[PDB]
């Protein structure tokens, strides 16, 4: 399973960001908003394969969680999908970049600004996010953000949709790889 | 599902799909409520989960 894939909690769907490690311990890195009140994790709809369980969330004011694996056959490709991903960087503005996401699938755009602030509302907001003119639909949040071989972010969320265009904020990747002391293979 | 703190500007992305009743899915709440919104409140809830 790789970065852009489907996962699914107990309650929703959401997309894997990357696959990282610390030792040799395996995890994947989503969503915030995803791993917040979820435990386990499976690959399919079916709940059939399991993955593993949430070690870490932060959300609001971050948006970013992390799963430890526990299935130990399972693939885990330090991909997104067939790209590979040699590093992180820091998004700047005019960068072009590319998501994939489980419902829409790879999409690409430009950095338009930084440290932005979503409001979700309810007291969830969120800081610090990348801005880009790249869409999203329900179902991609958690999912990578790269720009070639480069991590970049994790999809947090944003409006408009992939017909008519939209504004996707991320969460910026080298900051879940430093609070967990993890990295990207 | 109430839509009353609605609209927002930007919506969460994970997927827990309502069925409208223009037949459409939408992905989760906070897209469904918007688009209620933006319909005037004219579109309500058909069931949850997808169409």
Same mark, same amino acid.
């Given at each position: 399973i790789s970065g852009?894939?489907?996962? +699914?909690? @107990?309650? %929703?769907?959401?997309?894997?960001?990357?696959?990282?490690?610390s030792?040799?311990? +395996? +995890?994947f890195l989503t969503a915030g908003h995803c791993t917040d009140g979820a435990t386990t994790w499976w690959a399919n709809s079916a709940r059939t394969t399991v993955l593993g369980t949430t070690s870490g969330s932060s959300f609001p004011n971050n948006d970013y969680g992390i799963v430890r694996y526990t299935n130990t056959t399972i693939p885990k490709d330090g991909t997104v999908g067939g790209q590979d991903?040699?590093?992180a960087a820091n998004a700047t503005v005019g960068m072009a970049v590319t998501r994939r996401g489980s419902t829409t699938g790879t999409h690409s755009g430009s950095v338009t600004a930084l440290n932005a602030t979503v409001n979700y509302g309810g007291g969830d907001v969120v800081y610090g996010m990348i801005?880009?003119?790249?869409?999203?639909?329900?179902?991609?949040? %958690?999912?990578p953000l790269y720009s070639g071989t480069?991590?970049?972010?994790?999809? @947090?969320?944003?409006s408009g949709?992939?017909?008519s265009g939209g504004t996707t904020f991320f969460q910026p990747v080298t900051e879940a790889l430093v609070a967990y002391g993890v990295s990207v293979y | 599902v109430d839509c009353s703190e609605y609209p927002k500007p930007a919506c969460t992305g994970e997927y827990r799909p309502l069925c409208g009743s223009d037949n459409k899915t939408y992905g989760n709440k906070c897209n469904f409520c918007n688009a209620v919104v933006e319909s005037?409140?004219?579109?309500?809830?058909?069931?949850f989960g997808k169409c």
């Open positions: 852009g894939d489907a996962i +699914y909690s @107990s309650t %929703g769907r959401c997309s894997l960001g990357f696959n990282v490690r030792g040799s311990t +395996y +995890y991903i040699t590093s801005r880009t003119n790249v869409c999203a639909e329900p179902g991609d949040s %958690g999912g480069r991590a970049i972010g994790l999809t @947090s969320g944003g949709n992939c017909s | 005037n409140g004219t579109l309500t809830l058909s069931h």
